[PDB]
């Protein structure tokens, strides 16, 4: 029949970080169920209102808060 997910989140339970793949734009996905493939970590689990914030402010204003200098690899 239908595959369309509408409604993916029924409650928040626990943390979560910003997720984004290959096809998609800007998610906030649960630490709960796992990461497939084809993924990105934008930010990891911080306050769910400054992730929301941030993702919606870039979702607005196309600026990211510095891509580089966020890991050592070291």
Request: aromatic share 10%; glycine share 6%; net charge negative.
């Amino acid at each position: 029949g239908s595959h369309m997910s509408t409604n993916p989140f029924d409650d928040d339970n626990g943390a979560f970080f910003v997720l984004v793949n290959d096809e998609d734009q800007h998610s906030l996905w649960p630490v709960f169920a796992d990461i497939p493939a084809g993924w990105r970590v934008v930010h990891g689990e911080a306050s769910r209102a400054a992730c929301l914030d941030y993702v919606e402010k870039n979702w607005t204003d196309l600026r990211p808060k510095s891509l580089r200098d966020a890991m050592v690899e070291d």
